[PDB]
Each structure stands twice: as structure tokens, then as C-alpha cells.
Symmetry: D2
Subunit: 445 residues, 4 copies
Amino acid sequence: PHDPSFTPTQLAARAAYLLRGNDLGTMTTAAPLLYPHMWSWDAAFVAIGLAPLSVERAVVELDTLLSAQWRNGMIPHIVFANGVDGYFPGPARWATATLADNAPRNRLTSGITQPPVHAIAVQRILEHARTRGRSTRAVAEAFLDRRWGDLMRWHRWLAECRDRNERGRITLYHGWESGMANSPRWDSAYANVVPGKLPEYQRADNVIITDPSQRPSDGEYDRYLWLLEEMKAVRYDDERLPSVMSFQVEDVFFSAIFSVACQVLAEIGEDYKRPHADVKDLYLWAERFRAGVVETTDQRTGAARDFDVLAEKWLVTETAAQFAPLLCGGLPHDRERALLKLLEGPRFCGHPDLKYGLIPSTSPVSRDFRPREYWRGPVWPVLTWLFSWCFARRGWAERARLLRQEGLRQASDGSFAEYYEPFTGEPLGSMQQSWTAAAVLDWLG
Amino acid sequence: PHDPSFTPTQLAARAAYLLRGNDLGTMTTAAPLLYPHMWSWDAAFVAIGLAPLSVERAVVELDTLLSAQWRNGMIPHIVFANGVDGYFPGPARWATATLADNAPRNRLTSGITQPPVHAIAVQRILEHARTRGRSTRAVAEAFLDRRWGDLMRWHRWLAECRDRNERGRITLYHGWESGMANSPRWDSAYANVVPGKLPEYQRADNVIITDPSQRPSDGEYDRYLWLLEEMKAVRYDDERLPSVMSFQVEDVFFSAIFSVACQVLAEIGEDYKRPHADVKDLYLWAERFRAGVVETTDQRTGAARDFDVLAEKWLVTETAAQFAPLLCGGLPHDRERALLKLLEGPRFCGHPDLKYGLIPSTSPVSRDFRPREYWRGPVWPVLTWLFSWCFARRGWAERARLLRQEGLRQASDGSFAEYYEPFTGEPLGSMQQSWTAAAVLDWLG
Amino acid sequence: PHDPSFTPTQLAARAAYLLRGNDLGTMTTAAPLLYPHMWSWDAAFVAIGLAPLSVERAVVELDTLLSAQWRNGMIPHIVFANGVDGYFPGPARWATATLADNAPRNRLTSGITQPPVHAIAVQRILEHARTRGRSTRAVAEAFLDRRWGDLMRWHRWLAECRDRNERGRITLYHGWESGMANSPRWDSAYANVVPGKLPEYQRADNVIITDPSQRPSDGEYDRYLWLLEEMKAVRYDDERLPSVMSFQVEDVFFSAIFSVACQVLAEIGEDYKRPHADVKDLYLWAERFRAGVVETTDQRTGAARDFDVLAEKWLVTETAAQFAPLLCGGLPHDRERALLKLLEGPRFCGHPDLKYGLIPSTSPVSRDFRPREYWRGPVWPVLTWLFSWCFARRGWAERARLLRQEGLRQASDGSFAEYYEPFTGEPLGSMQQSWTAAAVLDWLG
Amino acid sequence: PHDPSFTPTQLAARAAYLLRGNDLGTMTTAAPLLYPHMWSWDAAFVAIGLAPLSVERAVVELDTLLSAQWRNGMIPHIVFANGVDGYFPGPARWATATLADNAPRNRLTSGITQPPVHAIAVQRILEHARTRGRSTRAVAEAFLDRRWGDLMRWHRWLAECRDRNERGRITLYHGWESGMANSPRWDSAYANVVPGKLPEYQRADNVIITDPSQRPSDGEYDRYLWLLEEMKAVRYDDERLPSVMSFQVEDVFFSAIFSVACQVLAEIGEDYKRPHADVKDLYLWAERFRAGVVETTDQRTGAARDFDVLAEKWLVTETAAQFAPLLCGGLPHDRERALLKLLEGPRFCGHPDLKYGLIPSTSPVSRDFRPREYWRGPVWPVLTWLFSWCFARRGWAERARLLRQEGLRQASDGSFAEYYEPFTGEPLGSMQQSWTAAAVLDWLG
Ligand SMILES: O=C(O)[C@@H](CO)O[C@H]1O[C@H](CO)[C@@H](O)[C@H](O)[C@H]1O
Ligand SMILES: O=C(O)[C@@H](CO)O[C@H]1O[C@H](CO)[C@@H](O)[C@H](O)[C@H]1O
Ligand SMILES: O=C(O)[C@@H](CO)O[C@H]1O[C@H](CO)[C@@H](O)[C@H](O)[C@H]1O
Ligand SMILES: O=C(O)[C@@H](CO)O[C@H]1O[C@H](CO)[C@@H](O)[C@H](O)[C@H]1O
């Protein structure tokens, strides 16, 4: 008609309807068909969206994810649903069940990790539970009793095994670990990934998303799948990966999230009387990774750089990852003002052709910008939510509110799209994406 | 805390979460455990609550109900879920699968009917679909193409087989057909139901609702189950029921709903160019049952009476059914003003001890009033919704708005209870009741 | 910026801020500068807008208007603010203070009337007061005691002096009495107004609204001002006007409003135990003017026609006044369906170039349509409100809701414009128009 | 009736209606009758409440206040409305027009100051203006050009003349300068004020508020009015006040507000390219007064203490002023956790008998607590707003949200009371208090 948008109550209802519709029982799929399994950072955001509906079911979501945690503490980025096909690479291609000595016996998983937003979900669950009364607080507190150790082991694995040199930045062995598969951030590192004898495969993602402008290329998937062959050759052994992987990058955005997550989990630990040594370690890691993020930044603009460990070079790109230091703090005053000017100016939120005042995944003025192509340009509601929540935590109440307002406007069509075209607002990627519904649910209050 | 109520967006989200949680696939249970099957008038209200979430799934709900329609047109009041136990009387006790020649081959059902609110659900589906654009309008219009004949056959069975004498009132053979099992309306008729050799049975309803003050008595269930034996003895044959049933009442509230439903379906038929003869029949029945309702009314107060066909006597009770004429219209001006004074005065919505300005199922000043006991007093959100929608259709915009406002206040605890204590607001009956969530969903807009 | 619309709470606050800003103390101006006095039907809508803010002040607004009522019962269409210039024709031009024996001694007023929406405002005040508690109900009931007789005298003057032949239509002697100065409705009647020696004047309205496309022409004003000379020459004597006025029309929209207002006031009289003879007269007039409206209607479409008393001919134009029978009822079922099809189709609300699904003052497909020119095309929020309220009173809950939704969308710029361009949504006429704020407040209060 | 609360849109409308009603033209009175003039920190909150309604009028409010600024930079706490009586002490009693060489020539003012919340109001005006488009941004930027120097002179007067020893705390010479006339904070200092021959007077405040339990005693007013005699005797000369005043206290809450205001104004200066030397001074003062606040704090709880300059002793009381360090920051991590535990525990927001989870002006468990008596116990909406805004600025998003939620619940009666009884929620003090409406509008605008 004249207005296809939904009212706040309609939109909240449809978002909860979606989330319950993607529930398999104890895990929520990231999307109905494109991503028909549990993903790690999606599961954190799903728990955030479930917290206003059922603290009990939000806790179940994190319990299911943690039940897939590897023996060394790694949370793998996919927990596969039993008997479900339709996603590639699936369990047979990872072969972690037969090759990975640390993989769980009772879940099929991938063999790589994803960003540690999980502590933020725990905070939102606790915040909801404290408004709901004693029986609900008891549910959330029982979850802390049951899973505090597992959360510690997750943060410790990141701090000790992916920051072996105590640089305060997380090393990745796959671009998929960044959450941003085809981000321009990784192009120069991927250009040095030379596949050898790569076993034949058929993609499934572009059978579901048929528009070729919206997904990575075959050449990019060849490199993604070649890194799997390198990992499988060493049976996913942490100790051997630095010797064999053709892709080794320090991810400054993942690092900033980790800093925030450690500080959040330390505050939880203080409030719920968790072991002093754990809280002390969490604060130490929060500070170490805050400093590691700051060390990457341009001394003029504050923009954070990734680092190619193999090439030994800073990776200078124009993506939303540059704003990593805004999430965790630590910049000198003048540098942070410069970085905020970059965020709000014509290269990002201030670009005159954007439909919404939101943060594109790649700067529209970058040569790498592609308005439809996944992480090369589109606006991702999950990043809107993460930036808005971290900005509110910095004390930037109006900046956070504006992102939430624009994210709700963008989402008001009810498509709950994976990402959106930055100029037209066209929904792109999968529809019915669980963390887009969760973002709306958290925002609407 | 200081305030356990939910905001409108929170409440809408939780109501949709509930509705999707009670979805078995193609049917929604009336409640998670007490009523773990599809009920007929509940399914209409569920379709109303689904319409803002998914016109496609709202249509599915009515398709599933109509697929259980009997060969003679009757919509049975329970469509049992395959393999589901926990409700008594269940499929084995009804034995319609082996005894009822008109029962559907591919569904297990009860052998009695329930009120014809279904046309109202169709109207709400169409209203939503018209705001959503062409593909959604096509879904709703395709449903009309597919099911108009079945809806006609339902209304025709009521008009021809339950009003054989063309009195403009529907005859019931079981109090369960009224929707109000233990209403004081039926006490004097039930007092003449003398069970003979009644086969042993174990109730399930009071294993789930253990508080004896909230459910009918064993003596009442003995009579409910004896009527089943009388119906089974004649193989549920319409032609033989008047000769054998110990309970035969004309239900003025069911009759008023039928009048409204015929008028609504006639208006749909005009708008979507359905057969002229059908629309003509629907308007004729709407007028006949409006007149039949008016004929029951007290000439002073307008209060509508039920009629005991066996005793040949008007049934004078003080329940919400007295307000039947307000739903369908037809009263003389002075009589309708008197009936509205009764509704708004100290015997119903104006009673000084009520927590909310809502319509109790039995007048709190009646000797039959029991504040916890099912239809003998509690406030039912489903009746709030039905009265508010019919009042808005009369043009009584402020009266309708006040009922909606108070119903939302009552529902703001998020219990989605089956019924509520009228003085304290305590949630009673089953929690997580589907038509209470549907009422909230329709209201919140 | 990206979206310059206000939220509902922002919009409600700004609407109330406007209405208080236009308050001179005991009267609210219709606008800040263009209309810096009290107008009669505006004052009724202002009272509706004040009722959610202050029942006491809403009652004051109507008391002030009724203190200007003429000795014969006429409510004049302007009550001038003492010492205020800036509007023409002003008190000196009307000369009612020196020429009109029935004009009030203690107010300066115009010498013509305006539509009787006042009973609708009384109903809204009473509805608000009944939600607010005993002290506020007493305020509203005291107003009824004080002003019931004046309201009766107003209705009686219309029924007896402007329907002298008991035709059930109100005769007007000036297009300004219709509320729609330059409606195409009056063009052929105005073509038969031939001014004599008209005293020189200077307009004020087009000094404030300088865009010539938005106000009537000088030629139109010459005729408006000449009719004043004709009234002044007979000292505004009711009995003489039929013999001297060059403009005499039966206004079918005014007539339908009067039918509704009589029925509304009759219901108020019953509820508050006013004299039975008054209630009986009100219902008689409601019926007479309903029938009078229906008698004008097109046999195919149901559209209502005005009547030129001097030319003795039906006035056939394509304006929103055609929809008069929808307000008061009375059409046969088939013809009202045809009239609603006209309303919702491509000649009015369904025209494909309209920005909002609202009723233009003149059909966009009529040769008379002018998209900027006052009553010749623009969308008026006051008419949106009146149609929405009357439609809800007919029982057409969804139709009323859609008009309210589109009216709120149009008003969400916060300009509170007098009227809006139908295709672009550009605000036109005066900004900060009191009855546009009142519509918004009622729709949200 | 059943619930006398207003909806958010109703409440926002009534709040704006109130604020416009208290507008005299270019100044808004703090209340209709009790406070019928402009007060300094009220005017800052009024500007915050006007910003969502009219950036232009919000700017006017601060322009009017700053036009009363004294020649030395002091903003006086009252700007009297010309020709208005009804408040005591009025202009004749202050005699600043004849005795104070620094008082403005064209305004009548008091001779003491009030807390510097004004920069917070400027920030809110700028935030609103940036959402409204170019013309509105220009209005706000023009105000900065016109008044930046005056704002600097205000901050400089506080830092240089009320912190002469650079201790980082503001000295007051009257309890009225704290904003909290009869706070238990000042009881021991007031016990050392011995009036001489005090000129006879009659109070006005307790003729308007007649309940003696709600205002200070005559004995307290004798001391308030005697301090005026001491100031008048030295012609309000800043350099003489330390030698003659019987009341000299360092106000830690005023100091923390000043710290925040300096940081806020410094950020405004950076964003709008104000002189670098001014920004540098503002950040220096922000740091100095932060440290000055922290130096007062209890080593166990972190609670901030006031200081009696004459008695040379720390003032230890149990009032909301203890929470000053939460506003400005600076406490060590462990002590701020202790201070938040005090805030949220049973001595303040977690007291089990409080109707709302809000901060009482005096702890309910203190021997000084009086639940009706002005600053000795009642909950003040203005403090709820200030704490919520400062908490959001610290990053404590959920804590700020809970204060806002409870503040809106308390205000939903629409009384807009000056303060509220902490246990019953009874509205106390003046009704229709401007800064209570402003808090509501900001929380909803
Ligand atoms: O493209 C893919 O196959 C997967 C690879 O893990 O990645 C996409 O989908 C995941 C689930 O929604 C997200 O977690 C990622 O952030 C997003 O990029
Ligand atoms: O008590 C029962 O076993 C059943 C008998 O049909 O009845 C109750 O539950 C049904 C499903 O919710 C409702 O349809 C009825 O209105 C309500 O009275
Ligand atoms: O143009 C004018 O001078 C006057 C003449 O009465 O008319 C306009 O202003 C009035 C006040 O707003 C409205 O009552 C009318 O409906 C509107 O047409
Ligand atoms: O009691 C009084 O006469 C005055 C003295 O300035 O103080 C009260 O009123 C002011 C205006 O509302 C507020 O600024 C104060 O905070 C409040 O305590």
C-alpha cells in the first residue's frame, strides 16, 4: 500500500515469531535454509533476543553452544544439527569428528572459531533476569554456576592459544573466524593462499542465494576450502597450525570484542562472587587486548589496522573494522575524536547517498566497495546492534540511540534480512535471519 | 520487582512467541498440556492472532480445522492431534471414528460442535491481507476459493439441523457445545440428566489443574460423560438425537454469534463475488437468528434467556450470555439502553470489587457466582475480545476501546491465562492459553 | 534529515504545545496569524483536542463560544478577539454590533453560521471525563446543566429557521457557512451573485498566505463580501433573508452533520436525564435530516447532491461532500456499497498518485480539481478526523482505523498544516492550525 | 478509576501543555503560583524539556537567563518576572537592584547562585537540533556564537570566585545555592547561624503550600533570611563574603555537577571550534573538581561528604548528595562498586517500603528522614532525571534505564508534582512543576 512498514508492536511480534520458528528444540538455526545449523556468534545474539521472551530458553541456547565446546576450550563456529543437510562445507568436509582429538564426542562441529560476544549475551540475560523476580534470577544464576568454568576456558583458550606471543591481538587461521568471510580486510592475505590438489566440491550457499552479486566468488571459495585441507592435514592441532597455515592474520575487530567481553565477564564475576583469580585474569586480558587494539591504530585518525602475520605487514583497508577501538576504549582523547569524525563523516555514516544513518561494512568511497556483495559494502543489522550496545557502554547515549533508531527504521519492513543494500535499503542475503530478529527484539524493549 | 508488567512491545513479542510455541505444524493446541489438541472456536481465535504474523499460517489453521469438517457440514469441537494423549474424553471415549458415519476419514474428532466464530476470523484475515499487498491478498483470496463452500456447509448445517423448527435459535445437545461447560445457564437442564450405567473413567483435566475450586465437579463430569453415551448409542445420527438426548437447550449466545457470523460472511460474499444464492441465504439466516435472539429477551431489561427444549421453559440466569443481543443487534431502542445499563452497572462491569472493568462470566451478585470456578464467575479474555470486537462493529467505539484497554491491563502480567479471578486478577485455569495470546495480538495492533 | 518525522510521543507533545500556544485565555485562535480569532466549528474541534489535556479548559472553550450565541439561537461562525486585527472581514465590516438586534452585547461576532459539530465535541468531553474520576465528571455534568438549553436553542434555530419548509436540509446564505469557502460545490450559485456598489476593501488573508495558488481569487472575495452587504441591508433579520439574498443553497454535508449531531445530543440527553421533550425533538430532527440527505442521492452511486434554492436545481460536483450519507446513514444497502466503492476507488482515496490514502476535498479526476487551491483539491486533516470518527460510529472499525493511520502519517512532519497537497504531501495554508493539532491529539490522547 | 494513569502519548501531551502554560513569553515560571518567576537550575531543565518542542524557544529560555547574568559572571538563582508578586523573598527583600554593583540593569534578580546544570541543557539542545535539519542547527549554532563567552564567564566565576583556594570544591554562602534548602546536609552549619535584628517578614510559600509537614519551619526561614542581611550589609561584594558570612560550606554535589558541566562544555567547545584556551580551561576545571569530589569520600563506602568551612569539619549525612562521585567519576574501582551497592541497597533505592525504585532525597533509614518534608526525604523527579542522565553518560545503560522507567511510572498520574512521598507516592509540594514536566518530556521526546 502507501506504507509497508510495521508498527513497533507488530514488528516485535513478528521478530519473536521468527525466533521461535527457527528453534529446532535446543538450538536455533541462524536462518531457515541458508544457515540451517547453530553458528557461534549468532547463538550469542539469539540468546540476547530470547532473553525478553524466556530467560530459561535463552540459557538453553548458550548451554547447547557450550556443550559443543572443544576439550581445549575453543567454541567452534558451527554446531551442526543432527541429520540436517543443505549447508556446505558440512560435517563430512570438516571431518573434525574423525580428525580432531579435541572435538566433542556428542556434537558435530566445524574446526575453526568465531568472535567471543558470548559474555555480552550473558550480561543481557542477567539484566533481564534481575527484572523478573526470584525464580528467574535463580535460572540465570544456576547457569553461571554451571557454565562459568566453560566461559573461562573459552576466554583462556583465546588469550593463550590465539595470542601465543602476548601481543594483545587474536590470530585467525581462516577469514571465516572473523565473521566476515569476504571482507576486503583479508584480500591481500588471501592473495597468498595458493591451493594445491583441492578435492571436488559443490557449493550450496549460491543455490539458496542465486544472485551472484550477493555471495563470494568460486575463486574465493577455493581458497576458503583449501585452508580446510591445511587444517585437516595436521588434525586441527593448535601446536601445528602456525607451521602449516597459509593464512595467519591478527584480527583487530575480534580483538576489540574480546577486550569488551573480558571486561564484561570480569564484572559479572565480581557481582556473582566467582573466583578471584578468574576475575583478575579477565581484567588482565581486557587491558592486554585493549592495548593490543590501540597499538594498531593510525596516530592521526585512530583507524585500527589488521596485521598479516605471514607477510609481517599492517593491513590498511577501509571497512567497519577500523572502528574496533571505539568498542573497547583506550585511545588517546584526540585520536578518538578523529576516529569518531571518520565514523560520522562522508566515508561512513555521513555518506550522502545512504538510505539510513548506519555503518556500511565497507566504506562506499573505497575502491573495494560493492553495494550488494556480502561484507564488501552492505549494512549488517548485527553490526548496528553491536556498535550501538558498545557505544551506550562508552557513555555515548545519543550516538547509540541514533544507531538503534536507524536500525529499527531499516528493519521495519519485517524482512529480517541478513544484510541490506546501503543506498536503496533492499533486503539482501537470507531473509528471516535470526540475529536480525534478535537485534530488533533487544532494541524494542 | 516494583512492577512485573510488560511493555506493549514485550507483551506482543511474548504473545507471538507463545502462539508459535503451541504450533504442532499445521494445528495450534489450545494450551500446552490441559488442551493439547485443536479446539474449534479456539482455532478461529488463533487464526485471528496469527493474521498479524503470517496470513499464510493463519489460513493454514482454518484449513486444518475445515479438513476435519463432518460430511453433513458440522465442525466438531475437538480435532485431536495424532498420537497425543493427556486429554479426557479423548478419541477412544468419543468413538466417532467407528460410530459416526459422517466423521472424517483422515482426522480423529469429537462428536459435538462449538460456536461459529469462524467467519469473524476470516474477516480479520482478509483485513490484514488487504494491508499487505498483492501476494498476500492472493493467499487469502485463494483460501476463499478453496473454503467458501465448506463455510457455507457449516452455516447451513447450523441453520437447518440445529434449528429444525426455524425458530432462529441453535439447539445444543451438550453444554460443551456452548463453550461454557459448567455455566449456571445449564444447571437446571443438567439436573434432569440422570446417568445410567456409565463406563468407568479417569479425569485428566484435574490432574493438570489440581486446585479443585477451578474445575467442574465429578458429579458434573458424570453428566457430561453420560450425554456421550446417549449420542454414541445412536451413532451420532442428527435425525435420532432429538429422540434420545437428555439435554436439549436453545443457546441464545451461540445464536447471537451465529447471526453476526452470517452477516459477516454475507458481506465477505458480496465483496468477493461469491454466489448470489449463498449471500441471500446468509443474510436471511443473519436476520432469522437476530430475531430469534430478540424473542428471548426480557421486555424491561433486554436480558436474553436460554430455553430448555425438554422442560419447555425459559432459563433465567445471571451470566454474561444475557448480553447476547448486544452482539447481533435487533433490540428496540429502549430495551437496548436498559441492557447496556445492566452491563455497565453494579451487577457486571460496574461491580465495585472488580480489579478490571471487564465482564465476569457470572454476575458477582448472583447466588451462583463462584470467583474461581471456570464459567461460574471468572473473567475470560476470549469473551473480552469477542464483546469488544462486536461492540466496535455496533459503532460503540468508546465502549469497545475500554474493554480492550482493560483486557490489555489484565493481560500485562504475561501469564496468558485461560481466565482470571475477577476481584484479585489472579491468573487461573491453564497458563499459556492460545486464544488469550491471540486476543492480545489482535488488540495491540 | 534521513527521516524528519516525529515519534507518537513527540508528535502528541508538539500538538499540545501548539494548542496551548494558540490559547488567548478563554478562547483558542484557529491559527496564530491567518485566523487570529475563535471560529465556530474550529472551536468544537479545539475542545476535542483539549479534552485529553484538561476537561476544565475544554469546557471553557465551548462556554466561550456559547456566550457569543445570538438571541435567536444562531452560533455565529467567528467570535472576534477583543482588540485583535489582522483578519478581514473584521468586526467593522460585519457591523453586527450596530445592525444585528440578535447579536450578543458582550462579544463581537460575525453574522453567519457554521456546521453544528458541537455536540460531537460534547460527547468526546464526556467520554474523557468519565475516565477521569468524580471531580472531573462533575465539571462536565455542570457544563451540561449550564449549556444544555443553549445547545437545544442552537439545534432548534437550525431546524426551524434554516429548514423553514421542513425538507430536512439546511439552507445557507453564504458559502462560508458550509465551512468550504471556494468548494466547486458553490461555483454555479456564485455565478448568480452580481455585486452592486461594493465598498472598497483590502484582503488580509493573501498577505499572510502570499502564494496565490493557495487562496481564493479577488473575484471570489468580491462575491463573498457582497453577500455581507445584502445581509447588512436587512439588519441580519432571519425573516428577510429569503427575500433578499443572492445566494441560497441547501448544503447536504452540513445537513448530514446536523443529523449526526442531533442523534449524538439526543443520546447525551437520555444519559444525563435531560427533558424528554428535548430528546424527542432531537431524534425527530436526526431522522428528518437523515431522510433529507438521502433524498438528494444519485440512484447509481449514492452520492449526495447540494441544491440551489434560487435556481431550483441539483448541484452535481465531485467533492468530498458527496459522501455525506456515509456520515448519517439512511441509504439502502446496495447504494451505500456503491458509495463506499466511490470513496475507496480511483476517484478519491484509491487514486494512484496520492501520497496518503486520504480523502481529497475535490476528486483529483474532476475538471474542477486544483491540488493547492484551498477547498478545490487539498487534503484537510479536519475532514480526515470527522470521517474517521463518523465511520467508527457506523461500525466500520477498520475503515476508520485506516483513515486515522494515514492522517497520523501525514501529520507526522509536525507542521500541523491547515491542508496538504494531495500528491506531494506539501503542507499548505496556515501552519500551526489548531484543529489539525486537535485531530492528532484525539487520535493519540 | 480502575487505573488513573495516563498513556505515554497522553502524558507527553500533558507535559508539553503544562510547560507552555507556565511560559510568560520569554521565561517559564518554575511553577504556576509557588514559584512564579524564573529559577536558574529550573530554567536549564525547562530548556531541556522545550528542546523536543521548539529548539528556538529552548534557546530563548537560556538567553533570558543569561541576560540576567551579573557583571562578574554569576548566574543568580532567581530572575524575577516584572510586576509579579506572590513569592518571598521578593525583589524588595533582596535589594540587589540598589545594593549590588554587579547586578544587571534590566532584570531584577536574587543575589545568590544555583548549580551549573546549564551546559547539560546546551548539550540536549544541540542534540535535538542536529536531528532537525539545517535551519534548526543554525539557530542552535547562533546561540553558541552569542552565549559561549557568557557560559565561560559563568564557569570561570565558579572556579575562580567560589573556589578561591583551588580545592576543587564550590563554596556556598547560602543553603539555597545548593538547590536543597532544608537538606539535613546543612543542619549543623545552620545551627551556627545566629540572626541579629532580623527585619520582620511574612512567608508566602506556606500560604500556597499550607500543609506544614511539607515546607521548612519558621526557625529555618529566620536563618535563611538572616544570611540575606549579611550579604546586603556588604553590598553582595564577592571579596567581602568570606569575612562576614555566618554560613560557608563546600557543596560536594554542586562540585560534581560542575565537574560534569565543565567536561560537557569542553566537548561542545571542541565540536563547535570554540577558542582552544577556553576548552583547555574547561578540562582543567573538570579534572580539578572531580578530584575535589573524590577527596571528600568515605574510605569504605565511597560516599561523598560536604565540608563546613567555618567549623573546619566534614559534614556526614545520609542524603542523595553522597552519590556525587557517581556523577563525575574519579573513584577507584572498588570504592565506586561500594558506592553503587549503597545506592541500590536497602538504605536508598532498594528500601523495601518504597513505592518506586527511585532515590529518596534523604535515606529512609536515617534519623533525619521525614517522608513529606521537602529535601528531608521525598523523591524529586528532577534528581531522578539528573542521575539517570549522568548514569547513561557513565556507560551504565541499564541503571539509567531503570531510573527512567520508575520515574515515568511515578509521573504517570499527571500531577507533575515537585516531589513525591517515597512510600505512598502521594504528590507533594507544588503541582504542575515545570522541571517535572521537562523530565518527562526528555524521557519521551
Ligand atoms: O557464509 C557462510 O557460509 C558463513 C560462514 O561461517 O558465514 C555467514 O553466516 C554465518 C551465520 O549467519 C555468520 O555467522 C557469518 O558472520 C556470516 O558471514
Ligand atoms: O473443559 C474442557 O475440557 C473443554 C471442553 O471442550 O472446554 C474448555 O476448553 C476449550 C479449549 O480451550 C474451550 O474451547 C472451552 O471454551 C473451554 O470451556
Ligand atoms: O477563509 C476564511 O477566511 C475562513 C472563513 O470562515 O474559512 C477558513 O478558516 C476557518 C478557520 O480555520 C475554517 O473554519 C474554515 O473552514 C476555513 O475554510
Ligand atoms: O523554596 C524555595 O523558595 C526555593 C528557593 O530557591 O527553592 C525551591 O524552589 C526552586 C524553584 O523550583 C528550586 O530551584 C529549588 O531547588 C527548590 O528547593
